[PDB]
Design a protein around this ligand. Structure first.
Ligand SMILES: CCCCCCCCCCCCC/C=C\[C@H](O)[C@H](N)CO
Ligand SMILES: CCCCCCCCCCCCC/C=C\[C@H](O)[C@H](N)CO
Ligand SMILES: N[C@@H](CCC(=O)O)C(=O)O
Ligand SMILES: N[C@@H](CCC(=O)O)C(=O)O
Ligand SMILES: [K+]
Ligand SMILES: [K+]
Ligand SMILES: [K+]
Ligand SMILES: [K+]
Ligand SMILES: [K+]
Ligand SMILES: [K+]
Lengths: 243, 237, 43, 270, 194, 237, 270, 237, 43
């Protein structure tokens, strides 16, 4: 017998362990690996795909309508269109997106985000809107003047239906927490900032045209985005074994 | 990304002057079964131009209450031309697709359609789905729960599947080329539908007062690079 | 470091240690016509 | 085919950019109708600095995401025996993970934890021998604690004790298919247009586990938990993730809803 | 090759269960026999070598060899068509439907036998050995049917027996293989043997 | 001139242990349309194994009053398997044949059948032929004037056409391979029958008292080297 | 001798064939009277395609079929001792497997599982020391729990505890013969024409196992199960498999039957 | 696979004009004991032509109630010629066989016999087999349970052992060459029977009314490549 | 991978890892006269 000394840890079942174990069917030979389109190797490939943001989360909005940002001919200037926190892993408009479902499977995130907007008004409907990203420090900007002092993009409606607003990674630390749960961990420390939209000029229409039109909101991770520390997705639960 | 196109398959040619590029699912064009993947030992049938052409299905009206419409593949063409004949007479089928969705309005209208092709799109919003919804034929079926995609997922995340949009201000058509997808080298064309093609309205049809209000949506599909095995007499599900 | 197999079947082996990612193009840009970043998409 | 997939081990760096006043380069202009995701990059939307980014991408690989044990079954014996059908729809966590891929191939590590409990479900410090037998379809299933089938001359069995470390075995990729399917738009048999035979991949069912206590317990019973861990994962065609609750163990049936996230007062208030 | 217990009917006992019955017809295109080709399910094939071993495993794959030998008198002639119908529906109802599948037309003569290869035509690389449906829904795997019909007729000279016998052989082809060992369901006991 | 044979086409294999060689009409096996003969400009369909296999037709009884029976080609298979489907869906068809006529009796019987394939065999013994005789379907039709061949010629001179005999003392089968014949590169498979296959008894069926008296005649035909042009919807004459 | 046996690791491929109209080649014609199995191949009966078949043949090898533990004995002590005759006819599963070969040579792995049970056969959590002694023919067999024979100075013994993992030892190929026989058309001794001495290969009997508890249990007893696993299997002359039930532990005696499979209404109905 | 044969051993020559090839069990002809397998140290006796010739046993009638008949080897010849003498006088025996089963009828009869040689074929359908059934002598014994092969197995699977068929329409004889099989280099010829030769009718004897009904089955066996050790006085079981 | 023996006798060794099959001719076609597939068996 070779002298051994077993140590603490022995017998334990760590769900993340990685040992080699005897196979139940030692000589079994699996079917061949055939050619199937669409193979994925890392889930980062999936969060880089744009998916729709449930931005219109208000009482009056039900179903498909919660994906539509509303625009309409103004009779006043510099007005606000929408506002939202850019944090990808907290409850709200972004939790049902691809970026969100996966950010919620992890505890920390890092990277620039891709916010793409597509206009859906008639071909004759024009307009200019300013979209801004306000870095941490205070509250969402109160007027267009305060918003344009941050990172922004002025969007002109035309043949190219969409525009991208990159919310670049600007953080004190290399990573942020995916939740801003405050009462315990004081994680509001990590808030990433706000994204607001305002009328640059106005939405102008010809006679008798619809005076309201819709903007769809897309979101994805940039190529420098990554997640760390897997954890159970909070939205999937049950009260007992399924029948 | 040109805005015009011509699609010629067999004896059928399709054109559009307001397209928005062409999507190829998963970056893979349709390919034949390789000798190392194959298992069925019989020499296959390859109809060629008789089954690999464009078939136009009956049009659907974009009404005010419209939620969307879907067609299952190969179910929708399971009874059209020689493609359908070949599908019935063989136990096994394999094949890709070329899809062209059409919907023109005018520069006085506004609306937006999501045109998506989903692999293995289950219609599971009912405990015991009715055959008329899982396999609706050439007329297809209407959406009842577009927000949950009829399968318990978020409509907004359906963009993870091959798709295009028909945004009336930008284009009057969507074009998709789909490869065969399955965990098998081949399968039965009557018992399993590999792809589902849905046209769901995400921004309602609107227009300047007095504009034409009758706006149809026409779907035209073409089998591509198909092959069949296990010949016998004709059989349907 | 040590990675040597004790058992007969490969199913007994420990987890794969090749954890990388690949270009998402087949998912993020499955189009036929190239649309360069510097250009306008629809022309 | 047409689109190639390069491989990398770190996220992309940021390189320094400068201002731009031009009519030839408009990276911010996109067209979502094409089906493509925007390709406007950081460097093109703002003036950036150089950042050698070494953040890795390992914990989001299929193997790092799936490679850990999760509960797939829990039960107690009734007469010193219990038959469980090998299917992962009982517990939702591992189920919701697997359904993120359409097709996938993987080996599995099964860990079995057992302990004795009395009638009031209070754990007992009792070491008893137990047997776990894998009975493939077509093999005779034991009717009770001492039927002849437990001789197990061909069926694989594992015999351990509630006082020994948990039992564990590895299992190969066993389907008749070339990958397991987690979504199936079809029927289980020909000539059946019934909703009860829709959406089930029969080749995903490889049998059942029958558990027993080698000798009878007097007044107590075996409480068993089966954990399963995917290994060597290969997957194809990512799917839209589950956004509504599971209701049935064997199907994806669900209850429609009108919103996913909770509402807020105004769309202009963050 | 081992003999198939094809004549599994009440009236057939012992050795007689191995005999397929032929007889001079007075009608045309009639049916002689029918059976599921699945080698591991209960029925005529379970007591054969192919069957006993297919039943020791959970999955199978491969072409099958179905050889038939005629045993009528040297003067008895005939032509029969044997067909393999792939999955999809039920066994064919008439000769016309059967001949649209894989078949062989057999002519009686000096060479007493004929082989009907039921080639491996499946969606998947393997099939389950049982079609147990109530639980696993394994009827998903049904491999098809094999039917026999009169191509012409069995003709005999004066005073000869008007019925003769066909023996049925079955074996696996060279591309057949089994996976996942399991206990044979037909071997059991109620308690230790005395 | 061996007396045994095996014919394998597609998924069908035929055998005989008492043949009498194999005839190839005009010494020409079936060939495809050459580029210098062709006129229809569209790419043809070539079904392959789906349509080029053996189809067995319902048997005919060699009765005492039996005069013969005939089948027209491609009419007889105009509704069988994928061959018939392809025939209906295309305006144009071209193709050859492999014919196997079967009739076994015993060494105690005597009789002789002429098995002939005639190019352009007109059924003109009536001023206004009935469609049921010119195009009798898969069941074929019975001879009413075998001596004058139903066309005003001598039955005895029908040997100028490709043929074999089924002389019960010598063989139980006849095998013929026919090439496509026409004054056109292609033609319509529903409006014109290129070949006619007749089985006429020239020496009556006789036998030793008590021998089996029920003797059938089975015909099995296979399209070979076929091609179709002018695809549209299905149409029959 | 005349017929050679080539070796292979995968089943045969399928290569593309074409049509055939000839009188020289008739592969479909066979003659079962010769004693030969048909040799008509797939490629010759139909038009086939190319199929590179890589399906393996490993799990049907003698070693993969036989190489796993199976129950061969089960018993309880009576007075703290029990004598079992080493023979595998008590339990039918492993027996029916071995009888698929006429002659065979193999080593064996014996695993012994023991536990204490009370008078009502209810398992007890009691760790007691037990002894298993192999007594070859001609050696003095213990009469009871503490006889002198348990000194075991020559006879092999294994001593373990009901609280320790199961005991296990390997055993060599021990017969006086050159292979074990699973069918023997002969008698056990000369000058015996009696049915009681027919069909038994005495050289297949190598002794007995005598089990005891090193010290007496008060009111309980040792419950023992012996598993046996063949290793390094070599076999000759495959046999017609068992198709009727076993009745006797020591002989192949059986009850005649008129059918093997259940009947059906008509031979023309599948 | 010729249909004629002549078998010449010693001073005996056998012929048949309607055979169906010749089977060699396990592909191995009879061979002598090699020096590395042998254990008995005494120089063996090798009778040669005196014991290695053809011995014909008394014929059995294929009656209407006939189930089959079997002979055990070497028991059946344990008392014939010098082969039997040598078997009795030696403790040890080793040897192979050449078996020729005969049964001619006419072209007006039909019937089929399975001719099988089984290694170690136990007659275990009784709890205490009678010596008259386990060792029936030169007259052999009749089958009582042919369906279960007298050993609890399926008659249909007996083809896993060396065999031929005597199908009256095809052949009037079966020929088998058997090698020595045992888990020992040699054994006693009186206490153990290595092979059993059975002739079981699977298709009953039938014929045209009035044909000869008295049809015998004759079995002729020849020891081949035999050797004996352990000489002493004569002894039988 | 590792296959090294610890014990003295070969009976202690693990299962053989050479699981192949061989030509079944000695069982499926134990005849003296060759009967090619393309030929008729009885001539
Ligand atoms: C002896 C120890 C027990 C070993 C048990 C081995 C069982 C074989 C594992 C099969 C794993 C396949 C699971 C695949 C898919 C899931 O069941 C799906 N949720 C069903 O739709
Ligand atoms: C000390 C641990 C116990 C080790 C026991 C060693 C016993 C020797 C094993 C002999 C195995 C031979 C079995 C061979 C044949 C079977 O008994 C047959 N069924 C009897 O006909
Ligand atoms: N097969 C055994 C019982 C199996 C066990 O309890 O381990 C018998 O029938 O006695
Ligand atoms: N041989 C010992 C008893 C053996 C034992 O109990 O271990 C004696 O006679 O005292
Ligand atoms: K980097
Ligand atoms: K751009
Ligand atoms: K992007
Ligand atoms: K191979
Ligand atoms: K042949
Ligand atoms: K074969």
């Amino acid at each position: 017998g070779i002298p051994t000394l077993y140590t603490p840890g022995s017998g334990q079942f760590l769900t993340t362990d990685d040992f080699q174990t005897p196979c139940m069917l030692p000589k079994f030979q699996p079917t061949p690996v055939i050619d199937i389109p669409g193979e994925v190797k890392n889930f980062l490939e999936v969060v880089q795909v744009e998916s729709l943001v449930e931005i219109n989360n208000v009482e009056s909005a039900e179903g498909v309508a919660r994906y539509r940002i509303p625009l309409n001919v103004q009779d006043a200037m510099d007005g606000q269109i929408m506002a939202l926190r850019v944090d990808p892993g907290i409850d709200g408009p972004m939790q049902s997106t691809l970026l969100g479902v996966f950010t919620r499977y992890y505890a920390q995130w890092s990277g620039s985000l891709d916010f793409t907007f597509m206009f859906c008004g008639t071909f004759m409907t024009t307009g200019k809107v300013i979209i801004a990203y306000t870095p941490p420090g205070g509250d969402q900007p109160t007027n267009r003047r305060q918003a344009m002092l941050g990172t922004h993009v002025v969007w002109d409606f035309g043949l190219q239906s969409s525009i991208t607003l990159v919310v670049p990674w600007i953080s004190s630390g290399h990573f942020r927490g995916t939740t801003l749960e405050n009462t315990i961990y004081k994680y509001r420390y990590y808030e990433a900032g706000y994204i607001t939209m305002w009328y640059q000029t106005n939405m102008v229409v010809p006679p008798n045209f619809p005076t309201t039109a819709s903007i769809l909101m897309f979101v994805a991770a940039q190529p420098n985005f990554s997640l760390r520390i897997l954890k159970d997705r909070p939205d999937i639960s049950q009260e007992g074994a399924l029948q | 990304s040109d805005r015009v196109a011509q699609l010629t398959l067999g004896n059928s040619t399709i054109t559009t002057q307001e397209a928005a590029n062409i999507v190829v699912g998963y970056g893979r064009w349709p390919t034949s079964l390789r000798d190392t993947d194959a298992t069925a030992v019989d020499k296959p049938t390859q109809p060629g131009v008789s089954a690999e052409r464009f078939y136009t299905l009956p049009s659907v009206q974009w009404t005010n209450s419209f939620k969307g419409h879907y067609w299952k593949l190969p179910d929708a063409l399971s009874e059209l031309g020689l493609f359908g004949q070949n599908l019935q007479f063989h136990y096994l089928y394999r094949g890709g697709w070329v899809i062209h969705v059409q919907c023109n309005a005018t520069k006085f209208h506004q609306g937006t359609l999501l045109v998506v092709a989903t692999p293995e799109h289950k219609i599971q919003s009912a405990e015991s789905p009715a055959f008329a919804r899982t396999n609706p034929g050439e007329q297809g079926a209407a959406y009842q729960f577009p927000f949950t995609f009829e399968d318990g997922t978020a409509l907004g995340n359906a963009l993870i599947y091959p798709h295009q949009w028909v945004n009336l201000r930008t284009n009057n058509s969507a074009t998709l080329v789909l490869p065969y997808v399955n965990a098998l080298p081949m399968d039965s064309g009557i018992r399993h539908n590999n792809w589902t093609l849905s046209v769901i309205p995400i921004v309602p049809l609107e227009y300047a007062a007095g504009a034409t209000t009758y706006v149809p949506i026409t779907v035209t599909i073409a089998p591509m690079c198909t092959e069949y095995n296990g010949l016998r007499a004709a059989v349907t599900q | 470091y040590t990675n040597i197999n004790y058992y007969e079947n490969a199913a007994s082996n420990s987890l794969n240690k090749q954890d990388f990612t690949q270009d998402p193009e087949k998912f993020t840009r499955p189009v036929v016509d190239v649309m360069k970043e510097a250009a306008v998409p629809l022309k | 085919q047409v689109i190639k997939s390069a491989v990398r081990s770190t996220v992309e760096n940021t390189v320094q950019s400068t201002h731009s006043i031009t009519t030839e380069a408009t990276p911010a202009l996109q067209a979502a109708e094409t089906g493509a995701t925007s390709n406007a990059s950081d460097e093109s939307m703002i003036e950036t600095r150089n950042v050698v980014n070494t953040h890795g991408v390992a914990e989001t690989s299929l193997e790092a995401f799936y490679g850990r044990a999760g509960l797939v079954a829990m039960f107690s014996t009734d007469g010193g025996i219990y038959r469980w059908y090998i299917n992962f729809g009982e517990y939702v966590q591992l189920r919701a993970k697997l359904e993120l891929l359409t097709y996938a191939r993987f080996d599995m590590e099964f860990t079995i934890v057992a302990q004795v409990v009395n009638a009031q479900s209070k754990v007992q410090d009792f070491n008893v021998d137990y047997q776990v037998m894998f009975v493939p379809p077509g093999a005779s299933v034991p009717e009770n604690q001492d039927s002849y089938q437990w001789q197990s001359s061909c069926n694989p069995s594992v015999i351990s004790n509630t006082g020994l470390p948990p039992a564990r075995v590895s299992v190969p990729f066993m389907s008749s298919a070339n990958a397991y399917s987690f979504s199936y738009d079809g029927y289980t048999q020909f000539g059946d247009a019934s909703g009860s035979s829709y959406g089930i991949v029969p080749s995903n069912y490889l049998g059942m586990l029958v558990v027993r206590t080698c000798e009878d317990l007097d007044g107590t019973r075996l409480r068993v938990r089966v954990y399963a861990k995917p290994k060597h994962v290969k997957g194809w065609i990512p799917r839209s993730p589950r956004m509504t609750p599971y209701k049935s163990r064997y199907t994806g049936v669900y209850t429609d809803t009108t919103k996913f996230c909770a509402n807020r007062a105004r769309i202009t208030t963050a």
